[PDB]
Design a binder for this molecule. Sequence first.
Ligand SMILES: *C(=O)/C=C\c1ccc(O)cc1
Length: 125
Amino acid sequence: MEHVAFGSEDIENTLAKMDDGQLDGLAFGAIQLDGDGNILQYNAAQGDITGRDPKQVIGKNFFKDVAPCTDSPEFYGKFKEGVASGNLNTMFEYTFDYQMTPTKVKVHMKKALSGDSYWVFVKRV
Ligand SMILES: *C(=O)/C=C\c1ccc(O)cc1
């Protein structure tokens, strides 16, 4: 149980110190992507939400392979703009409905600290 609150301002700084193990101790879903949409990290809680096996999707493209329902201007378009601009910090509600019971969630997308990495944070609403 790692104590970090969804939406926290210096969230990117706190999560820089964590590893795959410690990521699994978060109260919310966490996904780390590269600039092309590929999945680098995927924690235990996210799996709990989507039914995905954390390890089986690392390496896959989130927008093309794993989450086609986010391939839209409302999700993917926002991501591509932040990557192009090098800045991204947006929160919105979204429905996940691919191969799963339609699930309303809150998404927080933010640029990570390191190189070309981006966080996708998810909790139930
Ligand atoms: C739509 O396809 C939305 C979300 C989503 C996120 C993660 C995984 O693994 C599947 C689907």
